[PDB]
Amino acid sequence: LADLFPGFGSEWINTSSGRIFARVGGDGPPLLLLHGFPQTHVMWHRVAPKLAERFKVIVADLPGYGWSDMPESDEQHTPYTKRAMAKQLIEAMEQLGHVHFALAGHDRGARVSYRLALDSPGRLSKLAVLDILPTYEYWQRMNRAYALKIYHWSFLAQPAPLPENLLGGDPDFYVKAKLASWTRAGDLSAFDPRAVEHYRIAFADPMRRHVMCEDYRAGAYADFEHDKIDVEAGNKIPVPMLALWGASGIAQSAATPLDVWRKWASDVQGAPIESGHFLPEEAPDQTAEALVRFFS
Amino acid sequence: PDLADLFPGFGSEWINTSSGRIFARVGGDGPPLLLLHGFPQTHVMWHRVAPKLAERFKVIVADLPGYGWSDMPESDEQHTPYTKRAMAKQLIEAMEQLGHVHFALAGHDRGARVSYRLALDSPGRLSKLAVLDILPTYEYWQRMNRAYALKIYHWSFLAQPAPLPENLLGGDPDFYVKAKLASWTRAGDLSAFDPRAVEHYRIAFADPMRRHVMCEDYRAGAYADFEHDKIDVEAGNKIPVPMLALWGASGIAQSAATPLDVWRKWASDVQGAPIESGHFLPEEAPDQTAEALVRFFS
Numbered sequence: 001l002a003d004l005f006p007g008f009g010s011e012w013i014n015t016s017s018g019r020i021f022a023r024v025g026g027d028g029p030p031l032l033l034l035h036g037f038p039q040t041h042v043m044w045h046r047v048a049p050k051l052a053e054r055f056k057v058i059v060a061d062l063p064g065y066g067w068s069d070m071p072e073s074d075e076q077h078t079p080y081t082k083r084a085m086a087k088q089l090i091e092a093m094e095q096l097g098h099v100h101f102a103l104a105g106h107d108r109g110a111r112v113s114y115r116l117a118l119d120s121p122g123r124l125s126k127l128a129v130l131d132i133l134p135t136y137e138y139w140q141r142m143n144r145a146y147a148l149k150i151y152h153w154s155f156l157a158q159p160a161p162l163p164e165n166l167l168g169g170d171p172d173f174y175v176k177a178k179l180a181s182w183t184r185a186g187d188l189s190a191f192d193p194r195a196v197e198h199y200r201i202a203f204a205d206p207m208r209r210h211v212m213c214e215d216y217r218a219g220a221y222a223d224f225e226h227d228k229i230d231v232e233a234g235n236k237i238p239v240p241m242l243a244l245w246g247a248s249g250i251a252q253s254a255a256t257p258l259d260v261w262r263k264w265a266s267d268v269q270g271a272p273i274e275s276g277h278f279l280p281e282e283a284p285d286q287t288a289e290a291l292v293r294f295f296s
Numbered sequence: 297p298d299l300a301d302l303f304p305g306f307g308s309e310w311i312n313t314s315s316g317r318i319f320a321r322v323g324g325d326g327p328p329l330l331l332l333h334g335f336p337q338t339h340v341m342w343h344r345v346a347p348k349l350a351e352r353f354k355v356i357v358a359d360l361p362g363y364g365w366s367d368m369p370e371s372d373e374q375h376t377p378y379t380k381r382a383m384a385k386q387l388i389e390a391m392e393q394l395g396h397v398h399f400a401l402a403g404h405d406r407g408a409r410v411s412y413r414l415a416l417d418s419p420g421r422l423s424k425l426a427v428l429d430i431l432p433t434y435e436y437w438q439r440m441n442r443a444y445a446l447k448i449y450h451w452s453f454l455a456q457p458a459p460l461p462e463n464l465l466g467g468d469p470d471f472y473v474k475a476k477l478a479s480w481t482r483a484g485d486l487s488a489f490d491p492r493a494v495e496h497y498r499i500a501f502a503d504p505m506r507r508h509v510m511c512e513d514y515r516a517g518a519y520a521d522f523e524h525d526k527i528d529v530e531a532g533n534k535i536p537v538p539m540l541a542l543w544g545a546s547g548i549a550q551s552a553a554t555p556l557d558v559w560r561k562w563a564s565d566v567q568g569a570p571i572e573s574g575h576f577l578p579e580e581a582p583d584q585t586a587e588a589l590v591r592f593f594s
Binding site (some may be wrong): 128139142143144147150151153155156157158162165166167168169170173174177220224 | 358437438440441442445446449451452455456460463465466467470471472475518521522
């Protein structure tokens with residue numbers, strides 16, 4: 001596996017729920033970057049170098065993802081709920097002396113991110129989410145058209161071991177199908193081939209695949225309920241946040257993203273990017289420029 | 297293929313139609329009654345209620361087009377041969393080959409979708425209609441919410457463009473077909489099925505060409521079947537044939553809405569009763585299903 005963060009350090013951060021692997025680089029205000037499915041921290045390898053010019057960039061693998069430890073799940077998928085992942089990452093940042101930091105997330109990491117901002121808003125200076133609406137919003141707009149588009153939200157949430165057994169016949173196919181299908185081009189040309197190998201090797205592990213399904217199971221139940229409580233209470237994110245989405249990504253399909261995020265955040269700024277779902281890889285310059293301008 | 301004859305005394309017929317052969321087990325005498333199976337099953341799912349029905353009717357237990365031992369017509373981009381409108385036309389053709397232009401019809405799961413679509417497109421072909429543990433395809437997609445998407449996830453999963461579901465089903469087809477059978481029962485396991493019948497479902501599911509047909513069925517159910525259904529809704533077209541709507545107490549139809557009140561918006565003459573069962577009524581509750589079918593059809 002190639003080193004896609006030249007000049008970055010490598011930290012194994014002990015937490016109560018297991019170690020968090022993270023690439024660390026740059027100097028200045030701390031900036032935590034969180035990846036999503038079916039990816040690892042290396043999806044940031046094209047925009048984290050630019051972020052390292054201005055920030056202490058911490059490129060972390062999600063709990064259970066990449067090289068981070070995999071906490072054993074339970075019937076409620078607790079460790080892979082976004083609320084528990086946020087607590088673990090807060091604990092991880094405390095190990096480095098970061099009790100107040102900027103945070104940008106993509107896909108699952110973005111769901112950890114906005115959940116972090118709702119649960120522990122005092123930990124974030126600024127927040128950025130990439131090509132997501134809140135989990136509640138995806139489920140509340142799960143009509144026929146949307147159910148066909150993000151079928152994997154219902155499929156991967158099926159009880160174990162149904163998705164795990166089906167994924168176990170050809171994991172390379174599914175991980176590359178998911179990467180290709182969500183891009184603007186519809187193939188794998190946007191990604192670095194070395195980055196694809198990072199995602200393919202991580203997806204080759206049956207334990208890692210179970211974790212991702214547990215992530216999606218928590219996304220269909222516990223994550224939805226924690227969100228549902230916040231909507232119906234009217235709890236908004238007070239942290240100033242940036243909402244980035246691809247013009248042909250996932251978030252723009254179900255709704256107009258900025259109007260949705262204005263219901264969830266008292267101070268949200270939104271901008272589209274001509275790209276599919278993988279903004280930091282399909283459009284690295286535009287995403288990096290947007291994150292540098294926001295967090296500065 | 298060493299399977300089991302679950303229809304003793306029933307003859308076997310390969311009915312030639314324009315789009316390919318329809319396999320059927322034929323038994324009994326009297327008025328013609330066509331029985332249509334669903335997913336992920338074959339005609340043998342009727343093996344516990346077909347004999348009791350054969351006491352009164354010429355029972356025809358047919359594999360759906362592309363299912364079981366019926367031929368698999370070449371599909372197209374629109375999945376035409378596996379839309380319920382084309383399947384009903386092919387079965388109408390098949391029944392004509394036996395001299396049956398007016399017949400009773402009982403369908404379960406996918407076969408029930410062929411059945412009510414048949415009743416909507418050619419009601420003159422049906423004397424009476426029985427649908428088992430389904431609501432119209434349009435109603436499922438209309439009531440699509442978080443709870444339903446997790447419940448009938450395979451409606452979205454199998455409808456994905458090829459070869460995504462085909463390749464995933466190939467990862468463990470034996471587990472999948474058995475998981476579908478077990479998860480939709482009341483018991484939650486395979487104890488409601490005859491093991492010889494499970495062998496029928498597993499062998500058909502072991503063939504990748506058959507699994508591709510099933511995905512074509514579900515692609516049709518997510519697109520053309522929905523569009524065909526939607527037009528009847530917007531035009532207010534109702535099923536005029538006297539129909540019976542049976543559903544399991546723990547089946548798929550009770551999740552979204554109460555099946556009798558839904559089917560009353562699709563049909564002018566409909567009665568219904570819940571059967572203490574999961575989705576597979578004729579195997580989980582054979583005595584209860586056959587009696588209700590016998591009473592309604594006679």
